[PDB]
Amino acid sequence: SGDSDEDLLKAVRLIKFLYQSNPPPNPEGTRQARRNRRRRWRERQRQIHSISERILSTYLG
Amino acid sequence: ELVMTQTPSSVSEPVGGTVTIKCQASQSISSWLSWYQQKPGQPPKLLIYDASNLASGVPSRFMGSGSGTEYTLTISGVQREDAATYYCLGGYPAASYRTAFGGGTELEIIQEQLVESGGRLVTPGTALTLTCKVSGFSLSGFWLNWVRQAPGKGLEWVGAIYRGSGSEWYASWAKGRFTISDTSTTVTLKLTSPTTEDTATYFCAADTTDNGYFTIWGPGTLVTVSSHHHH
Numbered sequence: 023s024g025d026s027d028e029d030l031l032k033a034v035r036l037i038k039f040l041y042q043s044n045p046p047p048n049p050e051g052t053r054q055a056r057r058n059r060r061r062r063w064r065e066r067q068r069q070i071h072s073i074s075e076r077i078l079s080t081y082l083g
Numbered sequence: 084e085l086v087m088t089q090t091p092s093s094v095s096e097p098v099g100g101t102v103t104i105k106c107q108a109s110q111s112i113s114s115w116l117s118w119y120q121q122k123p124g125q126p127p128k129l130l131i132y133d134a135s136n137l138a139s140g141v142p143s144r145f146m147g148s149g150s151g152t153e154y155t156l157t158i159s160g161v162q163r164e165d166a167a168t169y170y171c172l173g174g175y176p177a178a179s180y181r182t183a184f185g186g187g188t189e190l191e192i193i194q195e196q197l198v199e200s201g202g203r204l205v206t207p208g209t210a211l212t213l214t215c216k217v218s219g220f221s222l223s224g225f226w227l228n229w230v231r232q233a234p235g236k237g238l239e240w241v242g243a244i245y246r247g248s249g250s251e252w253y254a255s256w257a258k259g260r261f262t263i264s265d266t267s268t269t270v271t272l273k274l275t276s277p278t279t280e281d282t283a284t285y286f287c288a289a290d291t292t293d294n295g296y297f298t299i300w301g302p303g304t305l306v307t308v309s310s311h312h313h314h
Contacts, residue, residue: 026179033177036250043224043247073293076113080179083111 030081037074044070084255085110085174089185097193102158106171106185115182116149117172117296118156119238120165126286126300127170127238131156133294158190166192175295176226176243176252182295183254184230187237195219195299199287202304206311211274213304215287218268223247226290227270228297229263231283231306241285244270277308 044066047059086109096102106116116134119127129138134149144162148155154173158165168189174182201213215227224247231239242253244263251263262273274281284305288297 029179032250032252036177036245036248039245039248039250069293076115077175077177080110080175083179 026081033077033081037070037077040070040073041067085112085178085180085183087171087173087183087185089171089187091188092186093189093191095191095193096161098161098163100161102161102165102190104156104158104169104171104188104190106154106156106173108152108154108173110174110180111152112173112180114149115174115178115295116147116154118145118147119170119172119297121168121170121238126288126303127297128300129296129298130169132296138298161192163192166190170238172240172296176228177245177250181252181254182240182243184238184240195221195289195291197287197289197299197301199285199301199304202285202306204307204309205274205277207279207308208276211277211306213272213274213285213306215270215272215301216268217246217270217289220289220291222291225293226295227263227265228288228290229261229272230286230288230297230300231281232286232303233280233283236283238286239283241272243290246270274306277306279308282306282308 047063049056088107090105114133118131120130121127130141130145131147135147144159146157168187170187171185174180176182196218199215205211226243227246228243229241231241240254241257241261242263244251244265264271284303286303287301289299291298
């Protein structure tokens with residue numbers, strides 16, 4: 023059962039990586055590409071949240 | 084830890100007849116269930132995703148169902164081109180119970196590129212390195228899985244890597260034995276001390292959505308672990 027503790031820590035580092043690898047977007051494209059990069063980021067953050075939630079609940083289920 | 088109990092082993096059905104393949108998860112996997120069709124000497128092709136969703140190009144005759152823990156693939160108006168071998172894949176690499184394939188059902192009837200190289204005849208003991216070259220992925224980071232298949236046996240999940248980080252995840256049997264590593268346009272699989280029980284075709288599959296299912300597969304590489312004999 024020593025593995026399941028390291029597994030959860032490994033799992034959290036991945037979730038942490040996921041978020042860190044989706045950084046807030048740089049303003050360029052005058053409200054058009056700026057709104058596109060904004061929309062894109064929000065979509066991805068929703069996904070990162072739902073994957074985290076699902077990964078994590080296997081460790082507290 | 085996760086065990087996909089698949090029934091039946093095999094099914095003989097005439098053209099037009101209904102075909103019902105079932106998977107029973109050992110743990111609550113939810114939407115984490117995908118169905119794959121595999122033809123002789125071909126890598127599996129994705130059919131159904133997130134339990135009920137149909138993959139792009141797949142005909143309507145293939146339906147995916149899921150009631151909590153029990154899962155179902157129905158091929159309704161069966162055709163001669165559906166004579167293949169079907170498997171379910173349940174779970175997630177990063178999940179506590181990992182991701183596992185069902186036993187598989189053999190049915191008889193009456194852009195993104197992945198290439199694995201390095202499959203050779205190693206002698207029992209000899210370290211081996213299988214390398215999966217990755218090209219055309221509009222994706223920076225994603226899961227790159229290693230799936231093996233012993234001759235005339237089912238698909239097994241070796242492990243995966245989240246292409247960005249160093250998040251290596253392996254099956255119970257695989258840990259210690261195997262080592263997945265990341266590079267620029269590549270991902271390797273190292274067999275540290277292989278036995279004859281490691282003779283199989285090794286495939287590298289990509290999860291291009293991060294939802295736990297394999298969309299793109301490689302051709303496969305044949306690995307043989309056997310000692311030489313006199314001629």
